[PDB]
Design a protein around this ligand. Structure first.
Ligand SMILES: Nc1ncnc2c1ncn2[C@@H]1O[C@H](CSCC[C@H](N)C(=O)O)[C@@H](O)[C@H]1O
Lengths: 265, 265
């Protein structure tokens, strides 16, 4: 009669909360999805060993089209767990799954976990200064989406930071790098000439948030464009005007050039 | 030797990540602060029990004025952990403490935990649609804070949702309720008259996020201002232009007036 949405956290199998682990361990069945994002620091095998339950992976279609036929049925007479990377419900489509639960006479509870949305605080940028968020999607064929460019412009205009999720291909397990995202943004700038993203733009890169050794780098595009930030996942951020405290953190902790103390404050 | 910033999560001792727990258990000294936020589901005793160590609680002054005198000295010869509610570097000024660690020659690492910043995903509102965040501070003396009102205005004009952290006076055990936050906003509205927050404004209240049965309510200010949302902590959210799937969730899960389903495109 109970369905539990449990977050797995940021990077590896230990990023689940103690609450999520204990509850998952006592569930009769455990489902999981890895299409909204992936856990680069671990494997399905390692997660299974930690939980002590077999985990049935579900595809985007399994969830969006058949959540009520694959998961909810067992949720009727058993305790079921649905694992997702990060914090449950951050992915836009997940929220409505709770309505499906209600429609089927099934109770649902949410067990939170660290999300990259809040983990970016490790960059030293004030969380309240983050505006609208966006995703840099890979251009494919004749399709060249650039809405994420406008989000940066509107946020920056108001002195707000812009969090950019990088496109993933759960398919080939392909991760878009910050380097690729920057190249894309330079192309869009050249296309829209809005003075929103150039070689002189200050940028922050956060790689492998959640691990004990994430890469936190800050600097101008011209210098970071071809820098190696390590293995995925990569997160890109375009800061708005900085508060002195933010700049000093980026310089002392993220290796930003002293120049940002007089150019971006 | 090293210093660890470890988040404890949203509500109880089990909201800490497994990573944070295994690391806390192995530290020689453990410090913590409980003034930036409040965990209404546990006690210092329960936290100490789970971690198996004595926790020295620090006040705002201990941290803000003597962090490098009380904590950092031990981090040079031992493995030290500093615990905080939610995520350690979210809606706090703890990031600056990492700079103090560097200058004292102490390597620091951050262990994230579920944060209210992302937990609001449980309200059904798309996380990417949240704009700048703000805090509703208790008016003191002849000083009446009102910046948070402008934040809502600015976000709303862009169709973005606004997350309003509510004030807290830990030493005086005062936790601002959504009702008090709504009252203050109506007053600011009377003064500025920007039509930003009125009796007809739709709002969302989230109480005790992280517990298994949080209170999630949506409705007009006139109907919610005197409603009982249970014990604190509380967060207040002023939605912007709603997507149809967001409205359905507010209605189905948060008991909002069915009329909001009729979105004005
Ligand atoms: N479980 C919870 N439910 C509702 N509001 C919460 C909450 N935890 C924190 N808050 C809100 O946030 C304020 C503290 S701000 C500090 C937040 C913390 N770093 C985090 O990551 O969550 C509180 O006064 C309250 O308004």
């Amino acid at each position: 009669m109970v369905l539990y949405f449990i977050g797995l956290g940021l990077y590896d199998e230990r990023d689940i909360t103690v609450k999520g682990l204990e509850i998952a361990k006592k569930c009769d069945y455990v489902f999981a999805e890895f299409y909204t994002s992936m856990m680069a620091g671990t494997t399905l095998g390692r997660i299974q060993k930690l939980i002590g339950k077999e985990i049935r992976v579900l595809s985007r279609e399994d969830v969006e089209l058949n959540f009520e036929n694959i998961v909810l049925p067992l949720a009727k007479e058993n305790d079921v767990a649905f694992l997702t990377p990060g914090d449950p419900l951050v992915a836009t489509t997940h929220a409505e799954l709770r309505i499906r639960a209600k429609r089927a006479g099934v109770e649902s509870y949410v067990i939170h976990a660290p999300s990259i949305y809040s983990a970016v605080g490790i960059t030293g940028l004030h969380i309240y200064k983050f505006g609208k968020s966006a995703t840099v999607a890979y251009p494919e064929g004749n399709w060249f989406p650039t809405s994420y460019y406008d989000v940066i412009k509107e946020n920056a205009e108001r002195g707000l930071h812009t969090l950019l999720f990088l496109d993933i291909k759960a398919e080939k397990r392909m991760y878009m790098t910050a380097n690729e995202a920057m190249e894309l943004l330079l192309k869009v700038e050249d296309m829209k000439k809005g003075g929103v993203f150039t070689d002189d733009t200050l940028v922050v890169v956060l790689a492998r948030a959640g691990s004990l050794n994430p890469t936190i780098r800050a600097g101008y595009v011209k210098d970071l464009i071809r820098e190696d930030f390590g293995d995925p996942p990569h997160i890109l951020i375009v800061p708005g005007k900085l508060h002195i405290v933010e700049a000093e953190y980026l310089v002392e902790i993220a290796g930003a050039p002293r120049e940002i103390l007089r150019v971006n404050v």
